[PDB]
Every structure is written in C-alpha cells, then in structure tokens.
Amino acid sequence: ELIKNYFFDEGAYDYHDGAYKHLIRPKTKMHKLIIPKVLKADKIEGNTTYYTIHAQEGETNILDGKATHTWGYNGSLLGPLIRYQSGRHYHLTLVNDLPEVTTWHWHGLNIPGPIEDGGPHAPVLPGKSREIKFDVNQPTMTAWLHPHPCPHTAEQVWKGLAAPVAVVNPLDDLPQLPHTWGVDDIPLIFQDRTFHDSQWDYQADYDMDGTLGDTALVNGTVNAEFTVTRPCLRLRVLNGANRRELRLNSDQNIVMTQIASDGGFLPHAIEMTKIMLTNAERAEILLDFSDYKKGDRIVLKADDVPILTLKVGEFTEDNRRQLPKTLKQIERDFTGSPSHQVIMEGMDDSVRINGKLYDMTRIDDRQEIGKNEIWDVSNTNDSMPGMGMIHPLHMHGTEFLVLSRNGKKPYPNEFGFKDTVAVNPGEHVKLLVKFNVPGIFMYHCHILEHEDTGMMAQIEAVDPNNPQHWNLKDLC
Amino acid sequence: MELIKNYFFDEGAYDYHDGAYKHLIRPKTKMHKLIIPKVLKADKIEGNTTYYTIHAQEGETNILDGKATHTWGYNGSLLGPLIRYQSGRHYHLTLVNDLPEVTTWHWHGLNIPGPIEDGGPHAPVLPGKSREIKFDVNQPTMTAWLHPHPCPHTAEQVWKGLAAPVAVVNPLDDLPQLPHTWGVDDIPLIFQDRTFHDSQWDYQADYDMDGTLGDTALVNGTVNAEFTVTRPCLRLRVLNGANRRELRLNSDQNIVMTQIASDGGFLPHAIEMTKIMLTNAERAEILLDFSDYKKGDRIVLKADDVPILTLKVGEFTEDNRRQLPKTLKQIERDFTGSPSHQVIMEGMDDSVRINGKLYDMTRIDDRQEIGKNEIWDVSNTNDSMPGMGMIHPLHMHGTEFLVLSRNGKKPYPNEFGFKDTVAVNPGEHVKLLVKFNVPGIFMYHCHILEHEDTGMMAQIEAVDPNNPQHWNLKDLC
Ligand SMILES: [Cu+2]
Ligand SMILES: [Cu+2]
Ligand SMILES: [Cu+2]
Ligand SMILES: [Cu+2]
Ligand SMILES: [Cu+2]
Ligand SMILES: [Cu+2]
Ligand SMILES: [Cu+2]
Ligand SMILES: [Cu+2]
C-alpha cells in the first residue's frame, strides 16, 4: 500500500555510466530558498492577457564568494512563475537581450507549432524580439519554459535559462490544495552544475552522453533551506538537469503524496517515501508536518546528497482540506495495434530515432488531429545492467497516456496524463496520443546533449479540413 | 474541513426552471467604475440620540453611457447611502417624502417597534408630507437594508430604484479585525436585475406575478462594474435586492469566499466556498484574499455565468489581514420540542397563499409572547418533481431567528448564524427558533416582491404580557 522504492529499472540508471559524476555536498552556508517572482501581466484587454519576457544576461550570487555570470528570464538566472489560464488568449512579446539566438519552448503547453511552440523553428536573433498569440485549452498542471534552439539547447539551459509555468484550468483544478505560491506552494527546480571560480563553463563539463555537474541546485539555490509556515506543503518538483536523474528521498522517509504528474493530476493520489524523475518529468507532491514540533528539519536529498532543508516554523494557518478519492476522471480503456512506432537507439554519439538523425526540413510522421492513435516508443539499449541507458521521450503539442510497459500496467503514478516518459532498455512503451491543435511538433529524447546530437524527429498534426503546405528551412 | 464547490438549495426548484425566465444579458457598454454609496451623515448628535433625515426623491442617473435613466432614490437619484446604526443607541428619523406617490421606510433587519417604526404597510408617508420616528437599537453586528414596503407597490417602488444598505455595529459582538474601511477594503455588492427600454426602467412592461425579471444585472446601480482592490483582504456585503432573481454568485477562477456573516450577524465559524446562492433579501458578508495575485490581474464575479463585477488588483497600500478566531460568535442552538407555530407557504404565480389565506391588513394571523423562544414550522407545498417547484424565501419583521432543521437534517453550512430570511425548497419543512424582543405588529411574507404584492403576507402580534397595547387595525391599500 505504501511505496518505498524508485520506479525505473536500476540496471540502466545514470550512475552506471563510465563518465558519471557523483554529487558533492558543497561546503557553503545554508542559503534561503529562492522563490521565482510571479510574472505580472502587461495589460488585460478582454479575454486576452499580455505578457513580455526578456531573455537576458546578469550576475547572480549563488555561492557566497563572487557573482556567477548567468542567463535568465526577466532576471539574472532562471525565470518567473508564468501563469496561464485554460480558456484564455495570450499575447507574448519575446525580447532577446542575449548575444546569441534563443527560442521560447513552452514545455507542457498545447499550442500551435512550430512558431508558438518555440521549437527550433522560432528563433529570435539578438536584439530583435518576437510576438505570438495562442489560446490555452488543457488541464490544471505544471509546465515549464526552456530554450529549444538547434543545436545549442543544452548550452543555453546550462547557462541558466529555465522557468516554471502554471496552467490553471478552473474545470479540473482543486483549490482545496495549497495555492499560496511561496508559502505553502513552492517549486523545486532541480539542476546540476559545476563551478570554476564561481562560474559555469559548459564547454569544460560537456559530455555528449549527457553533461553532469558536481553540485545540485534548487531554484538556482545551493544548500537551500525553506521555512514551512503551514502544515501542508505542495512541492512542484522538476528535473531541469541536462542528464542527471533526480532520485528524491528524505532523511526521515516522510510520506510523499503525489497528486499530479507532468500533464495534470493523477486519477488517485499515490503515497511514497521516494521518487525518481528523468529530465523534464514534473511531479506535484504533498508533505504533511502536523506530526512535527517547531525547528525540526526535514532534509530532501538527491541520492545521498541534501538539496533542500524544510525547517518547521510556527504554523500561521491550518491549510489541510479534504481531497476527493478520485482527483480526476480519465478514460483509459483503449486497446489495439500501434499506428505509430518510435525506436530510440544508441548512446553517446550513436543516438538516433528510427535510424535517422534530426533534419529540420523533414517531416518524420503525420497524424490526424483529434484522433486517438497508439504509439510504441521503445529503447534498444543493452538490458544487461551497466550497458543500458534511460531515455525520456518528450512530445511537443500534446499530453498523452501511458497505457502499458511491455504489456504490463505502468508505474503507479503513470495513469495521469504525461508529456514526458522514461523508456528503460528493452522496453516497449505503448502511449495513447491525441493532438488538439494542428502544426509541426518535435519528439526527442530530453537529455539535451542527445537532442543536440540529432535525437529529434518532427511530426505534423494534420487538420483534415485544412491540408497545409509547410515550407520549413534549416537553421543551425 | 472540506470546501463548498456547490450552491446550496435544491436545483430542481431554481428560478430558471420557470417557463418565462429571462437569462442575464451582459450589456454592451464601457466598464463603469463601481459606485460606492456615500455615508449618511447625522443631522446632530445630542447624547445617546443621533438624528437622521432621509428624503425619498426622484432624479436621473447615468447608468448606460447614453441617455440618463429616470430613477427613484434615497438622498440621491438612485438607491441610497450606507446608514449606520450602533447597538445601544437611540435614533430620531425624519422620513421626508418627495416622490409623487405614497411610500414607507421598511428597515429590513432592524428589530424595532411595529408597525410604525418598522416601516411596514402601516407606516405610509403621503407625498409632500414627512414623518418622525424614535427607536432604540439592540441587536448583533450585521448588515441590514432599507426598502419601501407599501400596499401593494412594494415591488414597483424597489424597481424604480428604492433600496439602501444598512450597517448595525454592536460593540459587543463586532470583530474590528475585519476590514472596516468602507469604500476601500469594505464594500457592498447590491445585486439587482433590470430591463432598459430606450435606457429607461418600465416596471409595468416587465411585470410578472411570479416574479419580475430583468435582462441586465446591476451592482450598486452600476453596469459592467469594476472595482480596484487597493488591499489584500476585501469584505463584500452581498445583497440580492432583485424582485425575484436568485443570485448565484461564482468566480471564473474559483477564488475562495470565506463567509463570515449571514443576514442576522456573524456565523459561529467561517465557511469557505467557491460559490454561493442567495434568495431575495438574503445578505452575506464574505472575505476574498488577493495575496496570491500580482497587480493588474482581474477577478470576475459573475451571476449564473454572467459577469457583474470585475475586481482589478491594484497596488496594495497596507496589509489588512488579521487572524480570526475559530469561533466568530457564540450561539446557543440547543432547543428541542414541538413547533408552537406553523406557516404553510403554497402556490405559484397567483396561487400564492399563506395558510390558505391572502393578506388582510386588518387581521392578526398569529400571536406570540415576547422574550420567549418559540419554534416555527415554515414549509412549502410546491411540486418536488424537478421543474415544477419554486423557492420561496420566508422573511419575518422585527426579529432574527435560528434555523434548527431542514426536514430533520442539519441546515446548510452557513445557516447556523442568525437569519431574518430563509429559503424554503418544495416539500421542505423548515423548523425555526424565533423570539421577539420588542412588542408590536410585524409581517411575515415571501420576499419575492410580486408575491408580497399579490398578497403572500400575514401579520403577527408580539405581545408583552405585562404592558399590552390594544390594537385596532385599519386598511390602507
Ligand atoms: Cu516540450
Ligand atoms: Cu523540454
Ligand atoms: Cu523539446
Ligand atoms: Cu537520448
Ligand atoms: Cu424586506
Ligand atoms: Cu422586513
Ligand atoms: Cu417585508
Ligand atoms: Cu412567494
């Protein structure tokens, strides 16, 4: 009934690789946890909400010595909480104030591709800016924004470009849940970085099988501590490393109630003392500190290494509210042969999707919008422990259902919608996919060095009432 | 603890189930700034007595952005000002009539001597003439209101534009933690439905015996109302002052409403909810909190899927949040036994009848000794079969009462506090606990005003056993 173990096949974990790097608990002061500021609108005129977002340089005190040269959204590093609302329209002004081209990929949002998507087709030259419009129609969930150029996605994210996104659909939201951002409701944006005189050098730490960093960050903070002012606490976890798998445990094995995955809430909640997330996998979780006095620390650790210390303070309210046994209604009853097939293969430099690398001008698949197709994403690495690797399939422009893993029921927290799934070596994952808008989307391994090296294919979501010519140019 | 994500009353008997119901049309005008009713300044304070003058008058109000709209109003063109009382005080009121027909001043909420001070259908003020009245006030901290209650034009007159919010602060039960800065962190939300004929209100045209409905929603006589929130906590004093329309208040972002009070003062404990339903005259004081909102973000409040008020978040000047006690007000509720009174509300359209009889102004329909706690059994004999039924709100003059039971089950979560107006669903027996404090003749009537007019009104005598006053009843109607 209670889960006390990490989910994916241990034999293929990251630490088996020959160029892994353990996390080093840094000898710095416990820093206070940085909450990303809420992005105010520039104006509201109707059902349209206006947003401006500068991607810009800056210097951030992360260590207690020098500043660190960082890139960031509307800031020095990282980015603000960008709230959307299902059933609204949004005009965004994407300013580029970096010295190289960037994009704005809305990892989670189901908006037209490839321009709004912010995939490798929506470049913004330095100095220049861009405007975009899109409706939003999807469930209540946590998304995020990262650059997705070609082929420098990895470098950019490393530099410090990431930002949490919150998409509240009034129709499936639970406002019982802690919603006081910063107090009872916080992000946990896990990242791994190496410091060279308090500076991040991507070129130095680069590895084509995934760039690892010896120090863990949390919302751009190191040795982060957070004072819990309230009994319930909703963490919105996110692995935004380039490769590192996030193995989240606690030093007192506090029960984590996972209420949501990437693409919205789970049918039912899932209690567990530990959790593994691959790159870009989100998890919304609830902890309860009723049975703790004041001053008691609860350390959260990536693997062996502390990353966030939850210090119990004087509770101001009681913010515990009854939840429904069924968090969200989802039809899962769908059988039949897969009408699509994705064969992820190779490691290091052998990374390829269905034998091919990425061609920006090519369409690699087509699927009618609105229809429920079944995909078969697989991984042909060596299952023999140590030989294998865990690739996470991400798909733009859609949330999908995990139906099965090699015929068997998916892990207990995979019944809810997902836009990012882990694929173990020798595993056939069968997904149920439906595209709501039309347009060109990507599907790619979300280890960002694999993406850069061509583990990226495109799909056209076709409207049957508007066959569209796509004139797609290569940009690299 | 749970969060209420639903209205309360039986959906099968909602207003929209009427054959000739009218959906609310969002009117196509410019967003208007919400009109806050000015404070009623005293005319003089000498001692424990505060002097008040109130002219009911005509005028012309800019509601739509084209032509003016002929309105009736208290000390103004439309509606009226915030009238403040204070428990344990005496008040001399000069009620001036500057209308072209007879009106009264019914103080809906106040527990003052009937039927002259009450402003019931016995306290007419002929045009041009005026009246003076004296009364103490001794009741809890609560939101009341003033509407005209003549025979039988109560409905017409309210429609013309006669209403006013009333605030009664008893020092003994008042919570000064709560936002008290009227116009800033503390505002009314007087919901009214009206139809415009070339920017003009025609009651006669829109009249229906089963309740007059209007295609446009007003809020403090404002249309497309916006209000700038200059502060984190905001205390709305919600009031349905329509003739029939039931106010189903919801938000498109499901902001939690913490109900602190009902009609007759505060609730024992606060009640969080994302939605709420109020029948006519039912008042609800609620708290919204905008902590988790940046600046510029709109929060729409809508009546049954039609916006009525846009709360725009502005630059907070203060933090006005203050910890509230788990118990907002202590109330004895433990009271058993057989009902010593019975009210049988029956009929729709013009079948409206209390215990089989219509309204007779010269007849006393019941008697109860003051001070004592009697139990009533208000009920409704409409058809429970969905569609076929109607929700009648029982109002009683001169008293606040406690809802004990609804068909033997506990009352809705926000009905433990005192009330002067209760909804009665079809097939429902509501058992109330009532006590009159002053003596005098009071009404009890359905507060759909076109029923009150057709004659869904009965009278009760509140009898002082020690000092009876002989009652001779004459009809003006
Ligand atoms: Cu994405
Ligand atoms: Cu991504
Ligand atoms: Cu991507
Ligand atoms: Cu890969
Ligand atoms: Cu009334
Ligand atoms: Cu009354
Ligand atoms: Cu009345
Ligand atoms: Cu009635």
Beta bridge partners of B255: none
Which tokens go with A207? 């590895």
The span from the CA of B106 to the CA of B118, in Å, is: 5
Reference A280, options A122, A391, A411; nearest CA is: A391
Picking from B381, B383, B422, B424, the residue whose alpha carbon sits closest to that of residue B402 is B422
* Helices (runs of H) and strands (runs of E) counted in chain A: 3, 31
Q: Do A321 and B253 touch (CB under 8 A)?
A: no
Number of A to B CB contacts under 8 A, please give it. Answer: 39
In angstroms and rounded to an integer, the radius of gyration of the C-alpha atoms of chain A is 21
CA–centroid distance, A90 to ligand 3, in Å, is 21
Cβ neighbours, 10 Å, residue A343: 14
The CA distance from B209 to B452, in Å, is 10
Count CB neighbours of B25 within 10 A. 12
Convert A412-461 into a string of H (helix), E (strand) and C (coil): CCCCCEECEEEECCCCEEEEEECCCCCEEEEEEECCHHHHHCCCEEEEEE
Query: Environment class of residue B169 by beta-carbon count within 10 Å: exposed (0-12), middle (13-18) or buried (19+)?
Result: middle
User: For A12, which DSSP code?
Assistant: G
Domain ranges of chain B: 11-16+178-313, 20-169, 341-463
Write the CATH number of the domain with boundaries A176-312: 2.60.40.420
Q: In 3D, which of A198, A185, A151, A116 has the Cα closest to residue A396? A: A116
Pick from A469, A193, A211, A474: nearest CA to A357: A474
Do residues B420 and B264 make contact, with C-beta atoms less than 8 angstroms apart?
Answer: yes
Looking at domain B11-16+178-313, its CATH class is mainly beta
C-beta of residue A306 within 8 angstroms of C-beta of residue A168: no
Residue A188 tokens, joined: 């946990």
- What does the alpha-carbon distance between residue B86 and residue B171 come to, in Å, rounded to a whole number? 8
For domain A340-462, give the CATH superfamily: Cupredoxins -  blue copper proteins (2.60.40.420)
Tell me the ligand closest to B163's alpha carbon: 5
Name which of A244, A193, A249 is nearest A219 in CA terms: A193
Find out whether A133 and A47 touch, Cβ atoms under 8 Å: no
CB–CB contact A321 B3 (8 Å): yes
SS3 B100: coil
CATH architecture of B341-463: Sandwich (2.60)
- Identify which of A232, A218, A219, A107 has the alpha carbon closest to the alpha carbon of residue A166: A107
Contacts of B298 in chain A (CB under 8 A): 44
User: Which residue is closest to B250 within chain A, CA to CA?
Assistant: A170
Enter the DSSP assignment of B428: P
Mutation site, B1, B294, B302, B321, interface A, largest A CB count within 10 A = B294
Q: What DSSP string runs through A126-137?
A: TT-EEEEEEEE-
B296 touches chain A (CB under 8 A): yes
Rounded CA gap, A247 and A322, in Å?
Answer: 29
Q: Annotate A352-419 with DSSP letters as a single string.
A: EETTB---TT----EEETT--EEEEEEE-S--STTS---EEEEETT--EEEEEETTBPPPTT-SSEES
Do A420 and A349 meet the contact criterion of CB atoms below 8 Å apart?
A: no
The torsion angle over the Cα atoms of residues B104, B110, B115 and B116, rounded to 10 degrees, is: -60
- CA distance from start to end of chain A: 50
Q: Which of A40, A44, A146, A39 is nearest to A88 (CA)?
A: A44
Judging contacts by C-beta atoms under 8 Å, the chain A residues touching residue B323 are: 316
CB interface of A with B, residues 316-335, below 8 Å: 316, 318, 320-322
How was this model experimentally determined?
X-ray
Q: Is A44's Cβ below 8 Å from some Cβ in B?
A: yes
Give me the sheet containing A185-193, strands edge to edge: A215-218, A185-193, A232-239, A282-288, A256-261, A264-272
Question: How far is B400 from B420, CA to CA, in rounded Å?
Answer: 5
- Distance in angstroms (rounded) separating the CA atoms of residues B455 and A214: 83
Region label for B224, one of left (φ > 0), alpha (ψ between -120 and 50) or beta (otherwise): left
Chain A interface includes B31 (CB < 8 A): no
Min Cα separation A113/chain B (Å): 28
**What is the Cα B18 distance to its own chain's centre?**
23
Phi then psi for residue B276, to 5 deg, are -165, 145
For B61-95, b/e burial (b = at least 16 CB within 10 A) is: bebbeeeebbbbbbbbbbbbbbbbbbbeeebbbeb
Is A89 annotated in a binding site? The answer is no
Task: Kindly list the distances between the CA atom of residue B73 and the CA atoms of B77, B82, B148, B476, in Å, as whole numbers in the listed order.
Answer: 5, 13, 11, 23
Instruction: Say whether A180 and B254 touch across the interface (CB within 8 A).
Output: no
Task: Judge if B20-169 and B341-463 fold alike in CATH terms.
Answer: yes
Does the beta carbon of B294 lie under 8 angstroms from any beta carbon of chain A? yes
Q: How many CB atoms lie within 10 A of CB B231?
A: 22
Q: Are strands A246-250 and B265-273 parallel, antiparallel or unpaired?
A: unpaired
Whole-angstrom Cα distance, residue B196 to residue B67? 11
Here the tokens at position B283 are 């008042």
> Cα B169 to the chain's mean position, in Å?
17
Q: Which residues of B are annotated as a binding site for Cu(2+)?
A: 106, 108, 147, 149, 392, 395, 397, 445-447, 451
B274 contacts on A by Cβ (under 8 Å): 175
Q: Output the CATH code of domain B20-169.
A: 2.60.40.420
- DSSP structure class, residue A124: B
From the list A233, A213, A210, A389, the residue with the least C-alpha distance to A302 is: A213
CA distance A367 to A342: 14
Q: Let me know the angle formed at the C-alpha of A346 by A343 and A350, rounded to the nearest 5 degrees.
A: 120
A38 to chain B nearest CA, in Å?
Answer: 7
Q: Which two tokens stand for residue B289?
A: 């909190």
Give the experimental resolution in Å. 3.5
Q: Please identify, in words, the CATH class of the domain defined by A15-168.
A: mainly beta
The answer to whether B253 contacts A168, with C-beta atoms less than 8 Å apart, is yes
Whole-angstrom distance, CA of residue B419 vs CA of residue B396: 9
The CA distance from B138 to B86, in Å, is 8
**How many whole angstroms from its chain centre is CA B445?**
13
Strand positions, DSSP E, B38-129: 44-46, 49-61, 69-74, 83-86, 89-98, 106-108
Largest CA distance in chain A: 64
Is residue A139 within 8 Å of residue A399, measured between CB atoms?
yes
CA distance B262 to B414: 7
Residue B294 to residue A38, Cβ atoms within 8 A: yes
In the structure encoding, which two tokens stand for residue B18, read together? 């009427």
* Cα(A444)–Cα(A459) distance, integer angstroms: 11
Cα(A163)–Cα(B132) distance, rounded to whole angstroms? 68
Interface test with A, best of B272, B292, B312, B322 (most A CBs within 10 A): B292
Closest Cβ opposite residue A321 in set B1, B253, B297: B1
